[PDB]
Structures are given as C-alpha cells and as structure tokens.
C-alpha cells in the first residue's frame, strides 16, 4: 500500500527478465533486489531471492503478482 | 395439503416419466417427518427439558414426546430411562403443512443460507438435516426465548434408494447445490 503510480523494479531485474524469458525457461535467477514487485511476465520462473545469507528459490505463481520479491523470502529464522 | 395436491398431480408425472415406472405405486411418496431435539443438558437442569418441549410444540404443531435414555452410559452421566431428548413425529396432513412451512418460509430464514447439502441420505432415500437456530421459525419470536439451541429434521420416504429421494425433493424444488 504505497507508490501511487507504477510498480517498482530495477533495470537489472526488468532487463534480466526480458532477457531470460525469450531465451527460454532456464536456471534460477539470482536476485538481490528484494524490494521490487512481481510482474505477470515473471510467472513460471524460479528466482532465488537473496535473504541475507542464501538465495532461496521460489516458483513464481499467478497469485504472487501484486506483492514484492522480498515478501516470499524470510530473513530471520525462529526455532 | 397444497403441495400434497402438487404431489398428487405433478410429481407423479415427473417421476413416472423420468423413472418409466410400471405401476403408479412404484413412485416414492414420503411417509413421515420426525423432528428430534436431543437436549443432553437435562442432567444439568431437569426443567430445561420443558423449554425444549415447548419449542417443538411450537415448531411442529403438536405436543412432543420426551425420549428417555436407552443405555445407561457413564460417559455422559445418564442412566436407564432418564429423559434426555424429545421427538415429535408428524404424518398425514401435518407433515404436508409443515413441509410447506419449512421449504417455503423456514428454510430461507436460515441466515447465511448457501445451497443445502445433498450428501445427507441414508442410502435408502430418507433425508436428514439439522438446523442450528430456533429463530428460523416465525413461531419462535426471539424475544421471549432464553438460549439458542437447535433441532434436526428427518424426512422419511418410501424411496428404494437415495436417487429417488433426490428426484422427489428436487420435484418439490427442495433446495440443494
């Protein structure tokens, strides 16, 4: 619930998706940009969001679109 | 008697033309409807059963029979022959007027009413449901009552299997999914 106009992505995630979608479904994309949204042309990819010491992969599903990449990668581990 | 007559000259045509019956008495007619209200809190309060015996006397149109405990189980602190429930069996015309009252004004006043369950059959064609509120009936005036309890309704038909009960109640436009 922020950012009135346009979603947010970096150029190193937007150009990295638009590079690696037309180049076939490939290797999981290491990404450090947790703060970026999930566009509908990212559905079907295994992207590995960095949580601080890992790059945890999450398969992008259709419901995950309005959220951000860091939302599906927890940082602190409890028990 | 209204949807008794509707049974007399629509549902017989629907069921004979769907189920190609040889005899007319192969049709499933409904035999009775039994309204149970099993209390359980009678061992905590003996005169609380009288409040339950007044509800079915107003939901149904006749004085209900209190039902004793058959077995003496210690798991619910009862003994042989302690009154723990109340049934009322209505037949004849009282079940057709009660059926019209039910599916006409009393089922829709169940709040948050989705389509009614259709899995509820005994495998012989006898429907059984349970309603959680007394407030769904206009006789329960909601202002003089004390606790919200429920009851359960058993529609006992002469169906040979569950599918004939489905087609019978579906011929009465009983609500389902």
């Amino acid at each position: 619930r922020s950012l009135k106009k346009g979603p947010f992505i970096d150029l190193h995630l937007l150009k990295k998706v638009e590079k690696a979608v037309e180049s076939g479904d490939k290797k999981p994309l290491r990404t450090w940009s947790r703060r970026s949204t999930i566009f509908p042309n990212m559905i079907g990819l295994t992207i590995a969001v960095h949580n601080g010491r890992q790059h945890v992969p999450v398969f992008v599903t259709d419901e995950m679109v309005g959220h951000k990449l860091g939302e599906f990668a927890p940082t602190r581990t409890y028990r | 008697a209204k949807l008794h007559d509707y049974y007399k000259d629509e549902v017989v045509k629907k069921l004979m033309t769907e189920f190609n019956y040889n005899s007319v008495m192969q049709v499933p007619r409904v035999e009775k409807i039994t309204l149970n209200m099993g209390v359980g809190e009678a061992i905590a309060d003996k005169k609380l059963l009288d409040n339950a015996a007044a509800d079915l006397a107003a939901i149904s149109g006749q004085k209900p029979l209190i039902t004793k405990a058959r077995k003496s189980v210690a798991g619910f602190k009862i003994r042989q022959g302690y009154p723990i429930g109340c049934k009322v069996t209505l037949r004849g015309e009282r079940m057709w007027e009660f059926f019209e009252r039910l599916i006409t004004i009393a089922v829709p006043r169940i709040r948050d009413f989705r389509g009614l369950s259709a899995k509820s059959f005994d495998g012989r064609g006898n429907y059984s449901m349970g309603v959680r509120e007394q407030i769904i009936f206009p006789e329960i005036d909601y202002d003089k009552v004390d606790r919200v309890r429920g009851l359960d309704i058993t529609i006992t038909t002469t169906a040979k299997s569950d599918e004939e009960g489905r087609a019978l109640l579906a011929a009465f436009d009983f609500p389902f999914r």
């Binding site: 259709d62 | 006397a57 149109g61 006749q62 004085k63 007027e97 006409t104 004004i105 206009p138 006789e139």
Partner: protein
Amino acid sequence: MKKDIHPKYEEITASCSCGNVMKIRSTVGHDLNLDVCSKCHPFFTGKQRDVATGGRVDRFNKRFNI
C-alpha cells in the same frame, strides 16, 4: 388426534416483502408479515458471486496501462 393437550393451530396468512400472499397453517399470533420466502431469496440466482471474485493479475492490470 388427542384433544386438550395440543397447542392452537390456525390457518393464517403469511405475506412477504416481494408480494407472495400465502395462507398456511401454524401456531402464530394474529397474522404473519414476512420479508423473505421461497420467492425473493437468493438461493436460485444470487449464489454464484463467491466464485467470480478472485485473481491478482486482473487487479494488477489497473496500474500498468502501457
């Protein structure tokens, strides 16, 4: 039927909001004035709104427009 044990049971007229004046036999007071009945109760059409509800891409496409 037995006498002098059963409640009163009178044919009354129950009318609803959408206009279904119908006289059935019950044990209520003067007469009944309903709102909903077998008619004008959404168990026949107004039931399929909970299915055509979800999705997130369709929500997302009010923000791109390019």
